[PDB]
Coordinates of C-alpha atoms and ligand atoms in Angstrom, one line a residue:
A1 CA -54.7 150.9 173.1
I2 CA -53.4 153.3 176.1
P3 CA -55.2 151.7 179.3
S4 CA -55.6 153.7 182.7
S5 CA -56.7 150.4 184.2
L6 CA -55.7 146.7 183.8
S7 CA -56.7 143.7 185.4
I8 CA -54.8 140.5 184.6
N9 CA -54.5 137.6 186.4
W10 CA -53.6 135.1 183.5
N11 CA -56.2 132.5 184.6
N12 CA -57.6 132.4 181.2
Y13 CA -54.4 131.2 180.0
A14 CA -53.0 127.9 179.0
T15 CA -49.7 126.6 180.5
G16 CA -47.5 127.4 177.7
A17 CA -45.6 130.3 175.8
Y18 CA -47.0 133.8 176.3
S19 CA -46.5 135.5 172.8
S20 CA -45.8 139.3 172.1
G21 CA -49.2 139.7 170.7
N22 CA -50.9 138.2 173.9
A23 CA -49.0 140.9 176.0
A24 CA -50.2 143.3 173.7
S25 CA -53.8 142.4 173.8
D26 CA -53.7 142.1 177.8
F27 CA -51.5 145.5 178.4
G28 CA -52.9 147.3 175.7
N29 CA -49.2 147.9 174.4
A30 CA -45.9 146.5 175.1
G31 CA -43.0 147.3 173.0
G32 CA -40.1 145.3 173.9
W33 CA -41.5 141.8 174.6
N34 CA -39.5 138.8 173.9
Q35 CA -42.0 135.7 174.0
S36 CA -38.8 133.6 174.5
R37 CA -38.7 134.6 178.1
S38 CA -42.5 135.0 179.0
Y39 CA -44.5 131.7 179.5
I40 CA -47.7 131.0 181.4
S41 CA -47.0 128.6 184.0
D42 CA -50.0 127.1 186.0
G43 CA -52.1 130.4 185.7
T44 CA -49.1 132.8 186.6
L45 CA -46.7 134.7 184.2
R46 CA -43.1 133.2 184.5
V47 CA -40.4 135.6 183.0
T48 CA -36.9 134.1 182.4
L49 CA -33.7 135.7 183.2
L50 CA -31.2 133.8 180.9
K51 CA -27.6 132.8 182.4
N52 CA -24.7 135.1 181.4
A53 CA -26.5 138.0 180.4
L54 CA -27.7 141.4 181.5
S55 CA -30.9 143.7 181.1
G56 CA -32.6 142.9 177.9
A57 CA -30.2 140.6 176.6
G58 CA -31.2 138.2 179.4
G59 CA -34.7 139.1 180.8
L60 CA -37.7 141.0 179.9
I61 CA -37.7 145.0 179.7
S62 CA -41.1 146.5 178.7
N63 CA -42.7 150.0 179.2
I64 CA -46.6 149.8 179.0
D65 CA -47.6 153.3 177.9
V66 CA -50.6 154.2 180.1
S67 CA -52.8 157.2 180.3
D68 CA -51.0 160.3 181.8
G69 CA -52.0 161.1 185.1
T70 CA -50.8 162.6 188.4
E71 CA -52.0 159.6 190.9
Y72 CA -51.3 156.0 190.1
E73 CA -51.3 152.7 191.8
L74 CA -50.9 149.1 191.0
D75 CA -50.6 145.7 192.8
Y76 CA -49.2 142.3 191.7
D77 CA -47.7 138.9 193.4
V78 CA -44.4 138.1 192.8
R79 CA -42.6 134.8 193.8
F80 CA -39.0 133.6 192.8
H81 CA -38.5 130.2 191.7
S82 CA -37.4 127.3 194.0
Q83 CA -33.9 127.5 193.0
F84 CA -33.7 131.0 191.9
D85 CA -30.1 132.4 191.7
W86 CA -29.9 135.4 194.0
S87 CA -26.6 136.6 192.3
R88 CA -26.1 140.1 193.0
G89 CA -29.9 141.3 192.2
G90 CA -31.8 143.1 189.5
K91 CA -35.2 144.7 188.8
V92 CA -38.4 142.8 189.4
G93 CA -42.3 143.6 189.2
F94 CA -44.2 146.6 188.3
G95 CA -43.4 150.2 188.7
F96 CA -44.0 153.7 187.0
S97 CA -42.0 156.3 185.1
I98 CA -42.6 160.1 185.3
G99 CA -41.5 162.3 182.5
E100 CA -38.4 161.1 180.6
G101 CA -38.4 158.3 183.0
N102 CA -34.8 158.6 184.3
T103 CA -33.0 155.1 184.9
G104 CA -29.5 153.8 183.9
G105 CA -27.0 156.1 184.9
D106 CA -29.0 158.7 184.3
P107 CA -30.1 160.6 187.4
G108 CA -33.3 162.5 187.8
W109 CA -31.4 165.8 188.7
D110 CA -32.2 167.6 185.5
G111 CA -35.9 167.6 186.7
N112 CA -37.0 166.1 183.6
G113 CA -38.3 162.6 184.9
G114 CA -37.5 159.5 187.3
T115 CA -38.9 156.2 187.9
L116 CA -40.4 154.3 190.9
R117 CA -39.2 150.6 190.5
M118 CA -38.2 147.8 192.9
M119 CA -35.3 145.3 193.0
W120 CA -33.8 142.5 194.7
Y121 CA -30.4 143.0 196.1
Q122 CA -27.6 140.7 197.7
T123 CA -25.3 142.1 200.1
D124 CA -21.6 141.0 200.3
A125 CA -22.4 139.8 203.9
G126 CA -25.5 137.4 202.5
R127 CA -28.6 139.1 203.0
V128 CA -31.1 139.2 200.2
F129 CA -34.1 141.5 200.1
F130 CA -36.2 143.8 198.2
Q131 CA -35.5 147.5 198.1
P132 CA -37.0 150.4 196.2
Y133 CA -35.1 151.7 193.4
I134 CA -36.1 155.4 192.8
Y135 CA -35.0 157.8 190.3
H136 CA -35.9 161.2 191.1
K137 CA -35.1 164.9 191.5
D138 CA -33.2 164.8 194.6
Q139 CA -31.6 161.2 194.4
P140 CA -28.2 161.5 196.1
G141 CA -26.6 159.3 193.9
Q142 CA -26.0 158.8 189.9
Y143 CA -27.9 155.4 190.0
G144 CA -31.1 154.6 192.1
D145 CA -32.1 156.0 195.2
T146 CA -33.1 153.1 197.8
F147 CA -34.1 155.5 200.5
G148 CA -32.1 153.4 202.7
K149 CA -35.1 150.9 202.6
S150 CA -35.5 147.0 202.7
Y151 CA -38.0 144.2 203.1
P152 CA -37.7 142.6 205.1
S153 CA -36.0 145.1 207.4
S154 CA -33.9 142.2 209.1
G155 CA -33.2 138.9 207.5
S156 CA -33.7 137.8 204.0
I157 CA -36.4 137.0 201.6
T158 CA -37.0 133.4 200.7
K159 CA -37.2 131.7 197.4
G160 CA -40.6 129.9 196.7
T161 CA -42.4 132.4 198.3
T162 CA -45.1 134.7 197.2
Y163 CA -44.9 138.3 197.9
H164 CA -47.7 141.1 197.4
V165 CA -46.6 144.3 196.1
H166 CA -48.5 147.5 196.3
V167 CA -47.1 150.7 194.6
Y168 CA -48.5 154.2 194.8
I169 CA -47.1 157.1 192.9
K170 CA -48.2 160.9 193.0
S171 CA -46.7 163.7 190.6
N172 CA -45.1 166.6 192.4
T173 CA -45.6 170.3 191.1
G174 CA -43.2 172.7 190.3
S175 CA -40.0 172.8 192.5
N176 CA -42.4 171.6 195.4
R177 CA -41.7 168.2 197.3
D178 CA -45.5 167.5 197.2
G179 CA -45.3 164.2 195.3
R180 CA -45.1 160.5 196.7
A181 CA -43.5 157.3 196.3
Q182 CA -44.9 154.4 198.2
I183 CA -44.1 150.8 198.1
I184 CA -46.3 148.3 200.3
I185 CA -44.9 144.5 200.5
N186 CA -47.3 141.8 202.4
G187 CA -49.2 144.9 203.8
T188 CA -46.2 146.1 205.2
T189 CA -44.6 149.7 204.5
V190 CA -41.4 149.5 202.7
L191 CA -41.3 152.8 201.5
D192 CA -43.8 155.8 202.0
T193 CA -42.1 159.1 201.6
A194 CA -43.0 162.4 200.0
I195 CA -40.9 163.2 197.1
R196 CA -40.0 165.8 194.4
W197 CA -40.0 163.8 190.9
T198 CA -39.6 166.7 188.5
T199 CA -38.9 170.4 188.4
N200 CA -40.0 170.8 184.7
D201 CA -43.9 170.8 184.7
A202 CA -44.1 169.6 181.2
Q203 CA -42.6 166.3 182.3
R204 CA -44.2 165.8 185.7
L205 CA -47.0 163.3 184.6
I206 CA -47.0 159.5 185.2
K207 CA -46.5 158.3 181.7
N208 CA -46.0 154.6 181.5
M209 CA -46.1 151.5 183.8
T210 CA -42.7 149.8 183.7
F211 CA -42.5 146.0 183.7
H212 CA -38.7 145.2 184.4
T213 CA -37.4 141.6 184.9
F214 CA -33.6 141.7 184.7
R215 CA -30.1 141.3 186.2
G216 CA -28.1 144.2 186.9
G217 CA -26.5 146.8 187.6
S218 CA -24.2 147.4 184.6
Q219 CA -21.2 145.1 185.0
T220 CA -20.8 141.3 184.2
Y221 CA -20.5 140.2 188.0
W222 CA -24.6 140.7 188.4
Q223 CA -25.1 137.8 185.9
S224 CA -25.7 134.5 187.0
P225 CA -24.4 131.2 185.4
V226 CA -27.9 129.5 185.4
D227 CA -31.3 130.3 184.0
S228 CA -33.6 131.7 186.8
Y229 CA -37.4 132.3 186.9
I230 CA -39.8 134.9 188.2
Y231 CA -43.6 134.7 188.4
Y232 CA -46.0 137.1 188.3
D233 CA -49.7 137.1 189.3
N234 CA -52.8 139.1 190.0
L235 CA -51.9 142.7 188.1
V236 CA -54.5 145.4 189.1
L237 CA -53.5 148.6 187.6
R238 CA -55.7 151.9 188.1
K239 CA -55.4 155.6 187.1
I240 CA -56.5 157.2 190.3
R241 CA -56.7 160.7 188.7
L242 CA -54.9 163.3 186.4
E243 CA -55.0 166.9 187.8
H244 CA -53.0 169.8 185.9
Ligands
CA1 CA1 -53.5 133.8 187.8

């Protein structure tokens, strides 16, 4: 199935390992799942980030094919484990990908896609926050555009604390800046900007939901020396519209 809406709170699940088949059954599709890192812990989904690893090698990186549309939103809760090792940062939670879904060192400059994802991040100065991480047509750098935004705007986020995340995305048209990228955390606006995602209309649609939980970054210094855990809950996905 290619869902256009999803509602998953994992409350019908036993504490214990969450298999690929469970994920495919709930999400409809999940083509990267590593059941070794997905575990239902007390009615929530715990993802494992393994020590001494980056990317898929140590985390869980799945793209859920959703019904194509121009307007999408999702909601979920996320909590870092009690002794989570912040390290440098990484990707967290549920986002969206338009067109070719640009990520990696591949900027949206070719006008063929981007992504709306979210990261946690630690500064050399010791602050730790959430931050948008957007590839799009006009990102200033080769890697993810944060738009200079962080949550909280001052101070750090805390371990063992549940944060509700709302994400809203809207396709642009042609070469116009009529799209939208929005992140709302605990009802507070983190990012709410108009945006140009694509200049190729054949790639303008929101195509799938990203579920990325991994450290990095690309270099070995984004790694952590310990296993760490992140917990998600109460995922609500909704296709608001498809409009050509
Ligand atoms: Ca739950």
